[PDB]
């Protein structure tokens, strides 16, 4: 009932850049094994246990924070549905504990070796440690995203990772089939060790970071008619000056004429010309050809026929006495000479060389060959089945100068051819300021998405920061005002510049600065808005984007700000710290969406609770009332009511005698008529729950089918880890008249069959006792009044109200107090960064050992509960 | 009738008899997954000994089986451990006690 604390942990996460994952046609084998060896831990050195466990997860919902979070604190792996925790003892998957029946079982002690054996197709996720594997898996989860290591690790720990067998060499040699994970690397990015979802870095003099732009799971895979009567014969001519600039640079660098083709001897049976060239050699550049002609009108690039004494008067290329070989045979190529480079078509070229080569990806996939940074032809794999823009420079040009021997050549030919989310960083309100004059700097290593000025303590981060009145904002990727509209001010950045805002507001004035000089508008006037009233006072607010480096200058001592000492020293201004014995605690925005209650004065929704009747019990609906004109934006709300309800713990396994001793309650929702019965989906949900998207429905939800049995591979139970236990709207559904979906919850027994008009419907599923469970609907409405909840009971199952609280269990008199109102999730919420964090650092001595991670820094934090929603 | 499921392996070689003194450094945690009871909290190990009838019998009889060295599980059932109402302000009455313990040393 009442709010609780203890001492808590902090944990960080470190991670290396290894992606995996599939879709229909990809580039992935599916087996890939790695171990982490463990030899430097700390027994207890903090209060609580030391959270040590190894797992993966998907980077879409996994993120874990140092403040705040679900739990009583300290949220690493297994402390959610994304990830697959293991300490040794208890397969944490979602906030659980369940128990592992393996010989001689224990925690991550030193001198042993810790890993998880992971595959793609089929769901599996066995664990490997001591010689021979526990016996707990995990399968049936959703894989919409990609896969990753990550390591927990508290106060007090040195652990290295066994990464392969290029910068590592693994003690225990894998089953046949299972191939180690230090060749999932991207070429042009070195295999990098970086904590997920990162905002800070420590600098030369604690600078801050934005969100890492993530690789989409809609990236890696390859997504690639008729015939002109006018490009026949010339298609062929095309294929055999490429013939001719095959011949012409071989001929120079040492390809030999030969009647066999060997690597090492250099011989060549296509040297002399296309006409000499065998028939499956020229069908090879025939297909070619037809390849790349076929995709010229592809695109709308309008080709014409024109010139046609141009192309006849140009000759061949001038053929010095080295240039030809000792064949006797030389190519004459067509000289482009008289033609130019355009850049039009040089940014058409670079697209068709993806255009003509992805379909090439396609090809070696379907015959089922792999990605890795080695090759290897009896394991069908090479380093070249990769999308364009994720390869690496060395192939760029080798491709496309070898292609761009043909499309200036049919211009010579007489042929022309035609053309997550950003965050806001700002302190606390209770620092800002009414009276007086202050000054910030902002230091700007990368050119990006910087926003910097002051804002308001009544900010909205519902809307993006520029947009409404409660922020006045610089523009420098564009340079120009964000207030209410957009009109030019001031000149572009430049990658380490120094820019800040102070205001007098003595008189209104607000002044940026860029490197002391002091930029003025189209006007002449170098401050930018007057006519400002103080009322609440402003706020010192920065954001950054996605990706991209900044951090806040405060200057707390005087020698500490550069660009300061050049202009405003003297007319009167000051830094923000003038007395300071503490740095500032900023706050900022994070890109976990989780829930806030409904204002009363909200412009879309509203909800209001009925009357007591005797026919209809009292109960709540929903309305909305600008549902016509003046941009109505509806979207699919997440109603929920605040109060959950837990279970029994340990299973059984009208009159009134016989409602007194059975646990059953019943509620339901009847959605109105005129609305669609597709996007109603009725049920419970559990607080594990922190995502947002548009268009969610129950082929995008995520279970994970958890097993344990015996060594010798005999079944004992079956567990089921959801987060969403819920059902269609639409699955037995202009309808006249309304429709009725229910849920029931025995809590004797824990079995939630589902009824709907009063018949009962198919599906049926049972969760673990100690999780709770909010009772939650997730609606589109396509009218105004559409959802109602019913606080009511038929004439053998008693209402919520007494499943709600201790006092009034056995009363049947269904009530709704004021306490349990509508429940909505918004993207965006404020959380805090202490000021002191984990300094992490990561060290390698010698080839087949492994980059470790230490730490150093004791560190505890007073955090809550608040047990009836259970978020830290 | 007490479950016990071992976290650390230890000695196996000392398991207390009457006549001995113990320390456990002990934590504790309900079935809800709320803390009650700790020695961290103190950096003192606390010390009893065996057959005073002074700690509760659903731990007497789980403390006098383990070693030196040993981290150990114990559930115990709420019929060992204040069964009808218990100490007002601790512990709700006929819920589950869960500890895990560590021996620290003499014997």
């Given at each position: 009932?009442?709010?609780?604390?203890?001492?808590?942990?902090?944990?960080?996460?470190?991670?290396?850049?290894?992606?995996?994952?599939?879709?229909?046609?990809?580039?992935?084998?599916?087996?890939?094994?790695?171990?982490?060896?463990?030899?430097?831990?700390?027994?207890?050195?903090?209060?609580?246990?030391?959270?040590?466990?190894?797992?993966?997860?998907?980077?879409?919902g996994?993120?874990?924070?140092?403040?705040?979070?679900?739990?009583?604190?300290?949220?690493?792996?297994?402390?959610?549905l994304?990830?697959?925790?293991?300490?040794?003892?208890?397969?944490?998957?979602?906030?659980?504990?369940?128990?592992?029946?393996?010989?001689?079982?224990?925690?991550?002690?030193?001198?042993?070796?810790?890993?998880?054996?992971?595959?793609?197709?089929?769901?599996?996720?066995?664990?490997?440690?001591?010689?021979?594997?526990?016996?707990?898996?995990?399968?049936?989860?959703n894989?919409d995203?990609?896969?990753?290591?990550?390591?927990?690790?508290?106060?007090?720990?040195?652990?290295?990772?066994?990464?392969?067998?290029?910068?590592?060499?693994?003690?225990?040699?894998?089953?046949?089939?299972?191939?180690?994970?230090?060749?999932?690397?991207?070429?042009?990015?070195?295999?990098?060790?970086?904590?997920?979802?990162?905002?800070?870095?420590?600098?030369?003099?604690?600078?801050?970071?934005?969100?890492?732009?993530?690789?989409?799971?809609?990236?890696?895979?390859?997504?690639?008619?008729?015939?002109?009567?006018?490009?026949?014969?010339?298609?062929?001519?095309?294929?055999?000056?490429?013939?001719?600039?095959?011949?012409?640079?071989?001929?120079?660098?040492?390809?030999?004429?030969?009647?066999?083709?060997?690597?090492?001897?250099?011989?060549?049976?296509?040297?002399?010309?296309?006409?000499?060239?065998?028939?499956?050699?020229?069908?090879?550049?025939?297909?070619?050809?037809?390849?790349?002609?076929?995709?010229?009108?592809?695109?709308?690039?309008?080709?014409?026929?024109?010139?046609?004494?141009?192309?006849?008067?140009?000759?061949?290329?001038?053929?010095?006495?080295?240039?030809?070989?000792?064949?006797?045979?030389?190519?004459?190529?067509?000289?482009?000479?008289?033609?130019?480079?355009?850049?039009?078509?040089?940014?058409?070229?670079?697209?068709?060389?993806?255009?003509?080569?992805?379909?090439?990806?396609?090809?070696?996939?379907?015959?089922?060959?792999?990605?890795?940074?080695?090759?290897?032809?009896?394991?069908?794999?090479?380093?070249?089945?990769?999308?364009?823009?994720?390869?690496?420079?060395?192939?760029?040009?080798?491709?496309?100068?070898?292609?761009?021997?043909?499309?200036?050549?049919?211009?010579?030919?007489?042929?022309?051819?035609?053309?997550?989310?950003?965050?806001?960083?700002?302190?606390?309100?209770?620092?800002?300021?009414?009276?007086?004059?202050?000054?910030?700097?902002?230091?700007?290593?990368?050119?990006?998405?910087?926003?910097?000025?002051?804002?308001?303590?009544?900010?909205?981060?519902?809307?993006?920061?520029?947009?409404?009145?409660?922020?006045?904002?610089?523009?420098?990727?564009?340079?120009?005002?964000?207030?209410?509209?957009?009109?030019?001010?001031?000149?572009?950045?430049?990658?380490?510049?120094?820019?800040?805002?102070?205001?007098?507001?003595?008189?209104?004035?607000?002044?940026?600065?860029?490197?002391?000089?002091?930029?003025?508008?189209?006007?002449?006037?170098?401050?930018?808005?007057?006519?400002?009233?103080?009322?609440?006072?402003?706020?010192?607010?920065?954001?950054?984007?996605?990706?991209?480096?900044?951090?806040?200058?405060?200057?707390?001592?005087?020698?500490?700000?550069?660009?300061?000492?050049?202009?405003?020293?003297?007319?009167?201004?000051?830094?923000?710290?003038?007395?300071?014995?503490?740095?500032?605690?900023?706050?900022?925005?994070?890109?976990?969406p989780?829930f806030?209650?409904?204002?009363?004065?909200?412009?879309?929704y509203?909800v209001?609770?009925?009357?007591?009747?005797?026919?209809?019990?009292?109960?709540l609906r929903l309305?909305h009332?600008?549902?016509?004109?003046?941009?109505?934006?509806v979207e699919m709300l997440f109603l929920r009511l605040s109060?959950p309800v837990?279970?029994?713990?340990?299973?059984?396994?009208?009159?009134?005698?016989?409602?007194?001793?059975?646990?059953?309650?019943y509620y339901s929702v009847r959605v109105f008529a005129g609305q669609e019965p597709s996007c109603v989906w009725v049920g419970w949900v559990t607080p594990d729950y922190h995502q947002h998207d548009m268009n969610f429905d129950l082929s995008k939800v995520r279970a994970?089918?958890?097993?344990?049995?015996?060594?010798?591979?005999?079944?004992?139970?079956?567990?089921k880890?959801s987060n969403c236990y819920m059902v269609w709207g639409g699955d037995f559904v202009?309808s006249?008249?309304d429709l009725v979906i229910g849920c029931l919850v025995?809590?004797?027994?824990?079995?939630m069959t589902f009824t709907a008009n009063?018949?009962e419907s198919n599906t049926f599923f049972?969760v673990?006792?100690?999780?709770?469970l909010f009772p939650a609907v997730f609606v589109l409405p396509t009218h105004?009044n559409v959802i109602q909840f019913e606080?009511?009971?038929?004439?053998?199952?008693?209402?919520?109200?007494?499943?709600?609280?201790?006092?009034?269990?056995?009363?049947?008199?269904?009530?709704?107090?004021?306490?349990?109102?509508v429940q909505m999730l918004?993207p965006?919420?404020?959380?805090?960064?202490?000021?002191?964090?984990?300094?992490?650092?990561?060290?390698?001595?010698?080839?087949?050992?492994?980059?470790?991670?230490?730490?150093?820094?004791?560190?505890?934090?007073?955090?809550?509960?608040?047990?009836?929603?259970?978020?830290? | 009738?007490?479950?016990?499921?071992?976290?650390?392996?230890?000695?196996?070689?000392?398991?207390?008899?009457?006549?001995?003194?113990?320390?456990?450094?002990?934590?504790?945690?309900?079935?809800?997954?709320?803390?009650?009871?700790?020695?961290?909290?103190?950096?003192?190990?606390?010390?009893?000994?065996?057959?005073?009838?002074?700690?509760?019998?659903?731990?007497?009889?789980?403390?006098?089986?383990?070693?030196?060295?040993?981290?150990?599980?114990?559930?115990?059932?709420?019929?060992?451990?204040?069964?009808?109402?218990?100490?007002?302000?601790?512990?709700?009455?006929?819920?589950?006690?869960?500890?895990?313990?560590?021996?620290?040393?003499?014997?």
């Open positions: 009932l009442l709010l609780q604390t203890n001492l808590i942990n902090y944990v960080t996460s470190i991670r290396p850049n290894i992606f995996v994952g599939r879709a229909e046609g990809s580039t992935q084998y599916g087996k890939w094994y790695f171990e982490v060896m463990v030899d430097e831990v700390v027994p207890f050195l903090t209060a609580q246990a030391t959270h040590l466990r190894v797992g993966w997860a998907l980077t879409e996994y993120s874990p924070y140092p403040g705040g979070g679900e739990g009583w604190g300290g949220n690493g792996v297994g402390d959610d994304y990830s697959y925790g293991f300490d040794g003892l208890h397969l944490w998957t979602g906030h659980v504990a369940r128990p592992v029946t393996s010989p001689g079982q224990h925690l991550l002690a030193p001198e042993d070796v810790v890993s998880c054996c992971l595959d793609l197709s089929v769901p599996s996720i066995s664990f490997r440690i001591n010689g021979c594997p526990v016996q707990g898996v995990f399968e049936a989860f894989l995203g990609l896969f990753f290591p990550v390591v927990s690790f508290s106060a007090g720990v040195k652990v290295r990772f066994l990464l392969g067998g290029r910068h590592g060499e693994f003690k225990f040699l894998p089953p046949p089939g299972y191939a180690p994970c230090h060749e999932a690397v991207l070429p042009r990015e070195r295999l990098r060790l970086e904590p997920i979802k990162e905002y800070r870095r420590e600098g030369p003099r604690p600078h801050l970071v934005g969100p890492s732009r993530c690789l989409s799971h809609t990236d890696f895979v390859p997504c690639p008619i008729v015939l002109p009567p006018h490009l026949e014969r010339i298609r062929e001519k095309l294929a055999e000056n490429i013939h001719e600039l095959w011949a012409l640079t071989r001929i120079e660098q040492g390809w030999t004429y030969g009647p066999v083709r060997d690597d090492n001897k250099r011989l060549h049976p296509c040297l002399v010309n296309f006409h000499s060239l065998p028939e499956p050699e020229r069908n090879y550049n025939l297909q070619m050809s037809g390849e790349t002609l076929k995709t010229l009108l592809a695109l709308g690039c309008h080709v014409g026929m024109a010139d046609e004494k141009a192309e006849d008067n140009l000759k061949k290329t001038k053929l010095p006495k080295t240039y030809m070989m000792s064949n006797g045979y030389k190519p004459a190529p067509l000289d482009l000479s008289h033609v130019r480079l355009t850049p039009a078509q040089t940014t058409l070229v670079d697209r068709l060389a993806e255009n003509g080569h992805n379909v090439w990806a396609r090809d070696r996939v379907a015959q089922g060959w792999s990605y890795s940074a080695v090759q290897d032809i009896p394991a069908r794999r090479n380093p070249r089945l990769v999308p364009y823009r994720l390869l690496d420079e060395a192939t760029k040009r080798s491709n496309r100068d070898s292609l761009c021997q043909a499309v200036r050549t049919l211009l010579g030919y007489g042929y022309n051819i035609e053309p997550d989310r950003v965050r806001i960083f700002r302190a606390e309100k209770s620092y800002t300021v009414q009276s007086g004059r202050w000054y910030f700097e902002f230091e700007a290593v990368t050119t990006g998405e910087m926003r910097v000025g002051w804002a308001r303590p009544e900010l909205r981060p519902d809307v993006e920061l520029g947009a409404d009145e409660l922020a006045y904002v610089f523009n420098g990727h564009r340079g120009q005002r964000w207030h209410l509209g957009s009109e030019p001010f001031g000149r572009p950045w430049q990658s380490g510049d120094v820019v800040g805002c102070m205001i007098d507001l003595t008189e209104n004035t607000i002044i940026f600065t860029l490197n002391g000089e002091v930029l003025m508008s189209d006007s002449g006037s170098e401050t930018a808005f007057r006519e400002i009233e103080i009322g609440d006072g402003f706020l010192p607010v920065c954001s950054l984007g996605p990706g991209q480096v900044g951090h806040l200058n405060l200057g707390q001592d005087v020698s500490s700000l550069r660009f300061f000492a050049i202009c405003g020293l003297q007319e009167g201004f000051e830094p923000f710290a003038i007395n300071m014995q503490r740095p500032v605690t900023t706050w900022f925005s994070k890109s976990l989780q806030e209650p409904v204002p009363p004065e909200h412009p879309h509203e209001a609770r009925m009357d007591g009747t005797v026919d209809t019990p009292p109960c309305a009332r600008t549902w016509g004109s003046q941009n109505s934006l109060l837990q279970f029994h713990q340990h299973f059984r396994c009208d009159d009134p005698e016989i409602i007194l001793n059975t646990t059953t309650y994970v089918t958890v097993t344990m049995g015996d060594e010798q591979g005999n079944v004992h139970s079956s567990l880890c202009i006249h008249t025995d809590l004797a027994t824990g079995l009063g018949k049972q673990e006792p100690n999780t709770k105004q606080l009511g009971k038929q004439k053998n199952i008693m209402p919520l109200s007494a499943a709600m609280f201790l006092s009034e269990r056995k009363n049947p008199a269904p009530q709704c107090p004021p306490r349990l109102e918004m965006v919420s404020w959380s805090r960064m202490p000021n002191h964090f984990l300094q992490v650092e990561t060290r390698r001595a010698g080839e087949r050992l492994g980059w470790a991670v230490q730490c150093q820094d004791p560190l505890t934090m007073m955090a809550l509960h608040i047990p009836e929603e259970n978020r830290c | 009738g007490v479950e016990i499921e071992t976290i650390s392996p230890g000695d196996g070689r000392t398991f207390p008899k009457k006549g001995q003194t113990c320390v456990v450094h002990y934590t504790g945690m309900l079935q809800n997954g709320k803390k009650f009871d700790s020695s961290r909290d103190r950096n003192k190990p606390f010390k009893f000994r065996i057959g005073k009838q002074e700690v509760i019998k659903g731990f007497e009889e789980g403390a006098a089986q383990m070693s030196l060295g040993q981290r150990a599980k114990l559930t115990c059932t709420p019929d060992v451990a204040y069964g009808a109402t218990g100490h007002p302000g601790v512990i709700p009455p006929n819920a589950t006690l869960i500890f895990d313990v560590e021996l620290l040393n003499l014997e």
